[PDB]
Design a protein around this nucleic acid. Structure first.
Ligand SMILES: [Zn+2]
Ligand SMILES: [Zn+2]
Ligand SMILES: [Zn+2]
Ligand SMILES: [Zn+2]
Ligand SMILES: [Zn+2]
Ligand SMILES: [Zn+2]
Ligand SMILES: [Zn+2]
Lengths: 93, 659, 596, 596
RNA sequence: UAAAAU
RNA sequence: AGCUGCUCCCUAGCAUGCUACUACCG
RNA sequence: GCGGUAGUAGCAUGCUAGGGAGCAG
């Protein structure tokens, strides 16, 4: 992507620390969640923010790698799932 | 984007440490000797706690080859070493030979940047990236059971209720949240600033402990790799084991590569793996497989010294020395030497491999390297040290399907573990001695000689700034005369004078306690430190063996007998075909019995019964084997010569000084 | 490479390589098979020949193991052992094998060529494992014989699919049938290159022949076609799982009062769940099929699989099921085969549906609650073991009529089989008892029922519904226009023309023929969609037409005649020259100018 | 490292290092090549050299197998035996080697110089493996002859197209050709950095040359230009797949009836689907390309590739093509090269639209249903096999007339190559026909084709609107006053001095001449633009004045002349000595001292 | 001389 | 799916060494 | 009848390589 080249050109030298490359320039984020309260305190709702950017949720799976919808993620339905979920979100503009 | 941060460190230094009369170098590259490297990396440890943790690690850069853009690392920002730039980078090339293919494959840069962003809440460890669209979970299947042997052991009266020996070691299973929930244990690793002045002398004493060896660079055609088939780290495990690689390279590719690391830096990627073996505590155990690229060099750089250590007797280190043929007795005798009121003691470091602060790891690498006085230059040695640290200290662990950063601690399975841990152990011991000695009412010590010793010790430690040799030698002699240490890779035994230890002239145990506390961030309950007053019975335990004084003919010898439950367990639980129908595996039991011989000479009963049990079982095994083989064909074998295996004497030979 | 003795199940490592199928044999058994038969070459972990180059003494009884290796009489080492020694042959576990007395009939099996019912009559009455081996070698001999047919080449091309072919002079020419396939080779010099698979069928005249191809390749003149052979897998499952009972019904669950139209059969429904398996004999397709589907309904949640051998059979069955079942149904039937089309409804491959229909040879390898084989009066013990191997369920039900049509098993040409000996369950029905029976027609006009009960049955049926419009013009058989020995008689259609038009509404009937090619020619001067008597046995129709070839043995077969005429509901007509049967049939024959 | 013999295809591990390409020779074949030629060095997994240091003897015939090494006669250890014996050489699989006796022509190729016709004549007349080897070889020879060039020194940087580039001394300067694409470097001091590529050509005057760069990086007086060089890759696919015929089209979906103005083309279009590939004979601008686009229309639901080698050709093709095509198109040619601008339509890299348009060395490993290539009169067998290697479509098609001009193949010095052997498919089209002749013309006037079909063609192509004033002012050539090597025909241009003003309405022409310095000295005595055959291929100037050079065939190169005719809309003047050629271009015969 | 195979 | 260290067992191969008897010369 | 050069088979040592298994950190 051109934005990578861009942030390269912003370097006073052309060398940048590795850790911040994917943080700013990735096109898709994956988050691993253990427990329900924790989920509530992060990607609750259909979109959220992280790392000064806006991410939108789409497609959520479980430990058994089966799809699950956001509806089921209640407080008391939670003891019915392979419960360290994987959430894949997209870079929203 | 900012990653330099130099005059910031200098500004901090000036605002606080204004009169610390010694030049500070924000980048160890500009250090003089090594002691300057220590005295600078120390301050760096403290200062690096301030800056963003998303600004350490590899320092990548865009390059071109054959009119094509790549991203490769050209340097590093060590939270203890400052900035380091690779010295031989080449923009714009036409093609790629083999070594460069390799060094661009074993790097995280191109891997990471081609990954999707990861944020996990399972661990407080700073995650980095993921390479797939689905994290993986690995389990640990349960062991397989060998019945007929169990029924046998029952039939001959074992395992009855209230018996002394019973089953305690087994094959614990592990579910799916094992790898990560284990790896998380690095949360016990903290940035700790170790006292520098006393370190600058304990390192001298430790060095003195290693005078009688020799090492240096060696040419590729001289390395020795026992067992050429082990996993090849990441991602080389996508092709084959080591032999494939150790073959496709010339004897110069190795030399070219080695001489290339002596001026540039190569990040790596470590893998975690779940050990699958019997144990006694359900918490799983794991191992770190390192990339081929680091080993292939660290070998050439250390193997000379290593082999120099693995073949010397009577040394304070005891690695490689075999216990058979009475050797164990030699060890226990020499560790007695001549201490005036000998007591024995041992201890153990809780989570020794995680809790090790980075400073001591660097200290160990320095002490090892100090032998290279000539097989290198002096910037070469520093770049070597840098590549080492970057490969086995803050490298990117590849757990599950994701890359995290390892804040510190020893990588469980590098090239130089066992020796490094031992060096660390000796360092801790010496530190405890120094602390205890300084920390006593100097006006109450009676032996005038010791009082002068303590005085001049403090003097040489805080006042004088340059190394003294004579006092170092005198002190080393004093320690070898009143603290005698047999060391292994963290596992120790100390024979020390009691009278002095009472008057706080050598470290007791509470000294060890305070030391681990204030220099290792952990606490060692005296529930595992063992003491011992009567030498006639050997040390309480060492490498998981007990010691017993048995009359072997005319005289008395120390012998190591293991823990019976362990042996029984090894008899009863295995991995499928193994042992199950063990009528093809006798050698297993041969060796096992070998390990369980000394239980014959034991005061308590059931012990020797274990031995006789193994014997009779071997006999029944071979018998019912021949019976089947006869029917299979129609004529038994011509000459088995296996009967010797079930006569006791042959085992006895494995413990007598003549081979 | 060991196993069990086909006669003693003892451990061994031998196979009578001289016998075709290489069966495992105990020591003593091997000694006896070899001493009493031209069968001599024994194979073990290695072959048994003299290892000295040149010596080819392969009669094992002459050979000697030398040092590790085997040797003749002459080239023997100074020290050795005689192999065929002491009423036994040396093999692994020699001192353990027991041996027994089934050797005579064994060699009888292995030595027959399936030419006379006797070797059959024994094939169906030996021990089960032996029965298996028998079926194996039978099918193998069939395949091997199939190779004996000639080769075909192209002579000149006529159209896209019209062609003139050239046969091997002096070789058996196999028939034009959808059950034959030919690999096409053309040769450059060099470059004997396969071109594809091609079936055949007779065009409108000789020797214009049509062909269906695998790809759109252009044809040439230096081309030829080899009928493609086949292999045969070995089997290991028994024919019949050991019969059992229980004290109470398990696994399956009735409803309550649903569908009383299936009333009386509930009695049978319980006892079916009460056994491990059972059989049912019934005159054509009456309670047969009807009862099967009724039971299927009875236990709703029961996962059920139907299967048979005849494609048209399973097709008629699946449509009858469609008549009454949730859909919620599939017939996972045919992959890249189905030369004749069949099922039209659902998938061919997911094995999720509760009510799965398919053909035996195309079955998957799956489990279910119960399974209902059908038309056992046609299958061979081979197929029975096949289905018991591929599938695995609790309750089995086999259905058929030992008066129907068995497997052709063409190879036999001397004598005839008693139906009792078609296969195992055939015996079971004919021997002890069919466990459950049904005796009434719900499908056929009463008059033909009377005729049949007067014939092959012992006047033991009843039904409903009588008239009309039935005849049996004993029209002399015109020219047997037999293309191959497969029969055709065009002047037989020479009166169909007189009912190709006189037919007021007999326009949607089905025509039936003793032979396939006379059936094809019926499709030529078309009247309607026709079929073969074998491809029948599964469906009924209001009107049906029937013309016959000559009075050949295949034709005048009473069973073929019965199962043919028993496929009609209200109208029927059959035309044989007929010296006797029209004396047995009860209709109203006419004369060529008398057709109303 | 191991492979099949280039002649007998035997699995072998030998390479004649004395052969430039190091091919794989079987044991026997290697023995023959070495005993026959001066190729006296053979490589296996290792070279065959006396391993005794200092003894630089290399050939096999004096080398002896050492204990585990190789040694000369003098240096051979006691037990040491030579390598080459029994007509065979010590090599792997030496048991199964077969060899062959065709070492003759193979040798001739391993020794030819590629400077003369007979080399190439043999080349396009041998076996496939030998053909590919010949292509590899001649291309490598051209590569090293290119390497014979050198760098240069920049005098000044005049303009973005005007540049001052003196060539390094002691080196044959690379002339003014688009082919001379040079890797430019801006020497910091330091900095072996390629600033891009820049190629050069003769503009409207010298010695200020014109240069185009793939990047507009402005040069200065300090740069230096190396000749871009690399290594030829070996090839695997044959020149062409064997042709296949079909009784129908394979997966082609013909259009119903859209844009039937290409109707005479659809009669041909379906033919494509019947043949694995085919060929096409046609003048450019005719159904040339037009046919291909109408074809892509005729099957509008199919992946199609269009390829050429010249970017001028891919622009002449891709434009006119996007016309009748949705856009919605693909012609994604150059990622990061192309000395000049190229495709302008979409994306570079995702093989999207069913119709792609690119150049040979840009075609990646992609697939289609049909691949099409014009320009066949120009590419090499090397190029054909490259095409086959990069594409795996289900159909292929070849367009072009050998009447045009082929690859430069500079090494030709003694003799000329016939279109008869330009390459394989061309050798066929000229030895068996294109199987499709294409007509007719479109742009040019009739009079420039009605007489020009009397030369290469057989009065075959037709056009109309013959006007205006297309004549041959055949002027007997003057003396030879050539400034550089190529001819200065200023007396020949002395026919237009009295005519630059006699044409007030024809002040819109363009000078042409074969020798490029005949373009140069005309550009000196210029008043109207110039354009030679070189940068042609897909354009037309309204007026043009053909100016001939020396009577040598360089002037009336009937191919070069013809193509110089075919690129016109209105008028032309032809001025040559011309004893016989003018009897084929029939116009108003005009003279020069007379103005009629 | 009748059915009819990842 | 690691880094070492010790130990047993099996197999091959090389070379030595040694033994002797069998063959050539002294 | 001895000494030196050629065989045999045997024995001893060792060294390499290859393969299996177990224990300690
Ligand atoms: Zn410093
Ligand atoms: Zn060194
Ligand atoms: Zn036999
Ligand atoms: Zn038997
Ligand atoms: Zn023999
Ligand atoms: Zn060859
Ligand atoms: Zn030499």
């Amino acid at each position: 992507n051109d934005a990578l080249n861009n942030i390269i050109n912003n370097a006073r030298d052309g060398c940048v620390p590795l850790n911040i490359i994917p943080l700013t320039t990735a096109a898709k984020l994956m988050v691993v969640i253990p427990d329900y309260n924790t989920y509530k305190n992060t990607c609750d709702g259909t979109t959220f923010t992280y790392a000064s950017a806006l991410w939108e949720i789409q497609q959520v799976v479980d430990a058994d790698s089966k799809i699950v919808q956001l509806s089921e993620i209640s407080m008391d339905n939670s003891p019915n799932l392979a419960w360290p979920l994987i959430v894949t979100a997209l870079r929203a503009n | 984007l900012k990653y330099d941060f130099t005059e910031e460190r200098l500004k901090l230094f000036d605002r606080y440490f204004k009169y610390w009369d010694q030049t500070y170098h924000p980048n160890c590259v500009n250090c003089l000797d090594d002691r300057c490297i220590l005295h600078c990396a120390n301050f760096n440890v403290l200062f690096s706690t301030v800056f963003p943790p998303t600004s350490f690690g590899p320092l990548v850069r865009k390059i071109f080859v054959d009119g094509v853009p790549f991203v490769v690392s050209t340097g590093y920002h060590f939270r203890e070493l400052g900035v380091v730039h690779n010295q031989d980078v080449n923009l714009h090339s036409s093609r790629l030979s083999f070594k460069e293919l390799l060094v661009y494959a074993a790097d995280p840069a191109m891997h990471a940047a081609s990954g999707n962003l990861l944020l996990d809440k399972r661990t407080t460890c700073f995650s980095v990236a993921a390479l797939t669209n689905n994290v993986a979970f690995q389990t640990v299947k349960p062991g397989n059971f060998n019945k007929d042997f169990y029924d046998f052991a029952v039939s001959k009266g074992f395992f009855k209720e209230g018996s002394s020996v019973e089953l305690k070691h087994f094959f614990f299973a592990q579910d799916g949240n094992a790898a990560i929930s284990d790896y998380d244990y690095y949360r016990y690793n903290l940035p700790t600033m170790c006292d520098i002045r006393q370190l600058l002398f304990v390192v001298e004493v430790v060095d003195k402990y290693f005078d009688c060896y020799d090492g240096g660079c060696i040419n590729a055609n001289q390395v020795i790799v026992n067992n050429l088939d082990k996993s090849a780290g990441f991602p080389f495990n996508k092709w084959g084991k080591a032999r494939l690689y150790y073959d496709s390279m010339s004897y110069e590719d190795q030399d070219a590569l080695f001489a290339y690391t002596k001026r540039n830096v190569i990040p790596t990627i470590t893998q975690m793996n779940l050990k699958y073996a019997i144990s006694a505590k359900n918490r799983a155990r794991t191992v770190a497989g390192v990339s081929i690229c680091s080993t292939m060099t660290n070998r050439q750089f250390h193997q000379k010294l290593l082999k120099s250590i693995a073949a010397t007797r009577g040394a304070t280190v005891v690695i490689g020395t075999s216990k058979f043929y009475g050797g164990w007795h030699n060890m226990l005798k020499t560790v007695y030497s001549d201490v005036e009121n000998p007591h024995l003691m041992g201890w153990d470091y809780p989570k020794c491999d995680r809790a090790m602060p980075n400073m001591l790891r660097i200290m160990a690498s320095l002490v090892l390297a100090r032998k290279h006085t000539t097989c290198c230059s002096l910037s070469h040695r520093f770049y070597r040290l840098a590549n080492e640290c970057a490969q086995v200290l803050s490298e990117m662990v590849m757990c599950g399907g994701s890359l995290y950063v390892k804040p510190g601690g020893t990588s469980s399975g590098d090239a130089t573990t066992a020796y490094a841990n031992s060096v660390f152990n000796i360092c801790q011991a010496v530190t405890a001695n120094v602390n205890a000695l300084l920390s006593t009412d100097g006006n109450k010590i009676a032996d005038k000689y010791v009082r002068n010793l303590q005085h001049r010790l403090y003097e040489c430690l805080y006042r004088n700034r340059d190394v003294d040799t004579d006092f170092v030698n005198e002190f080393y002699a004093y320690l070898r005369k009143h603290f005698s240490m047999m060391i292994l890779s963290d596992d120790a035994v100390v024979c020390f004078n009691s009278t002095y230890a009472s008057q706080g002239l050598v470290a007791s145990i509470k000294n060890f306690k305070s030391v681990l506390y204030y220099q290792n961030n952990v606490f060692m309950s005296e529930a595992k430190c063992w003491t011992e007053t009567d030498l006639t019975k050997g040390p309480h335990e060492f490498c998981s063996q007990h010691t017993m004084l048995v009359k072997q003919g005319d005289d008395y010898v120390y012998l190591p007998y293991p823990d019976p439950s362990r042996i029984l367990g090894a008899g009863c639980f295995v991995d499928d075909i193994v042992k199950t129908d063990g009528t093809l595996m006798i050698e297993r039991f041969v060796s096992l019995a070998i390990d369980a011989y000394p239980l014959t000479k034991h005061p308590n009963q059931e012990y020797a019964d274990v031995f006789h049990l193994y014997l009779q079982y071997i006999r029944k095994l071979h018998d019912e084997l021949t019976g089947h083989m006869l029917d299979m064909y129609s004529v038994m074998l011509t000459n088995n010569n296996t009967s010797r295996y079930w006569e006791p004497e042959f085992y006895e030979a494995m413990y007598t000084p003549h081979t | 490479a060991v196993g069990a003795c086909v006669l003693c199940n003892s451990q061994t490592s031998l196979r009578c390589g001289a016998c075709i199928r290489r069966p495992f044999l105990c020591c003593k058994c091997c000694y006896d098979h070899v001493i009493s038969t031209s069968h001599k070459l024994v194979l073990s972990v290695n072959p048994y020949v003299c290892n000295a180059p040149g010596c080819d003494v392969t009669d094992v009884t002459q050979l000697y193991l030398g040092g590790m290796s085997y040797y003749c009489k002459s080239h023997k080492p100074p020290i050795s052992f005689p192999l065929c020694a002491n009423g036994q042959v040396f093999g692994l576990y020699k001192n353990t094998c027991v041996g027994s007395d089934n050797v005579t009939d064994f060699n009888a099996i292995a030595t027959c060529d399936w030419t006379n019912a006797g070797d059959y009559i024994l094939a169906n009455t030996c021990t089960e494992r032996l029965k298996l081996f028998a079926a194996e070698t039978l099918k193998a001999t069939e395949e091997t014989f199939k190779l004996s047919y000639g080769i075909a080449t192209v002579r000149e091309v006529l159209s896209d699919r019209e062609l003139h072919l050239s046969w091997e002079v002096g070789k058996p020419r196999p028939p034009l049938n959808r059950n034959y396939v030919f690999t096409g080779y053309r040769v450059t010099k060099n470059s004997k290159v396969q071109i594809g698979e091609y079936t055949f069928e007779k065009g409108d005249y000789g020797d214009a022949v049509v062909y269906r191809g695998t790809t759109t390749y252009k044809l040439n003149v230096g081309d030829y076609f080899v009928l493609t052979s086949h292999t045969v897998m070995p089997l290991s499952a028994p024919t019949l799982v050991p019969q059992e009972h229980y004290v109470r019904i398990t696994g399956l669950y009735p409803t309550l009062n649903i569908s009383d139209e299936f009333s009386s059969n509930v009695a049978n429904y319980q006892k079916v769940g009460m056994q491990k398996y059972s059989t049912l004999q019934g005159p054509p397709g009456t309670g047969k099929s009807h009862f099967a589907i009724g039971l299927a309904l009875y236990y709703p949640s029961a996962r059920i699989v139907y299967t048979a051998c005849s494609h048209a059979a399973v097709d008629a069955l699946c449509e009858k099921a469609l008549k009454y079942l949730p859909i919620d149904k599939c017939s996972r039937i045919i992959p890249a085969r189905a030369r004749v089309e069949c099922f039209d409804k659902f998938k061919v491959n997911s094995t999720l549906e509760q009510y799965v229909f398919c053909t035996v040879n195309a079955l998957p390898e799956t489990t279910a609650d119960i399974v209902v084989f059908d038309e056992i009066s046609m299958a061979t013990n081979y197929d029975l073991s096949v289905v018991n191997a591929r599938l695995r369920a609790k309750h089995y039900v086999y259905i058929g009529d030992p008066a129907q049509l068995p497997a052709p098993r063409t190879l036999l040409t001397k004598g005839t089989l008693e139906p009792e000996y078609f296969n195992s369950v055939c015996r079971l029905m004919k021997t002890i008892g069919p466990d459950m029976f049904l005796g009434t027609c719900r499908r056929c006009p009463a008059e033909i029922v009377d005729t049949v009960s007067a014939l092959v049955y012992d006047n033991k049926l009843k039904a409903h519904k009588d008239k009309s419009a039935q005849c049996f013009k004993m029209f002399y058989k015109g020219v047997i226009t037999h293309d191959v020995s497969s029969a055709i008689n065009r002047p037989q259609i020479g009166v169909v023309r007189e009912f190709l038009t006189r037919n007021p509404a007999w326009r949607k009937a089905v025509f039936i023929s003793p032979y396939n090619s006379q059936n094809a020619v019926a499709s030529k001067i078309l009247g309607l969609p026709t079929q073969t008597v074998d491809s029948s046995q599964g469906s009924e129709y209001d009107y049906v037409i029937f013309t016959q070839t000559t009075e050949t043995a295949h034709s005048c077969n009473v069973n073929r005649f019965n199962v043919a005429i028993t496929r009609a509901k209200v109208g029927i007509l059959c035309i044989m020259s007929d010296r006797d049967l029209y004396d047995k049939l009860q209709f109203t024959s006419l004369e060529i100018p008398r057709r109303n």
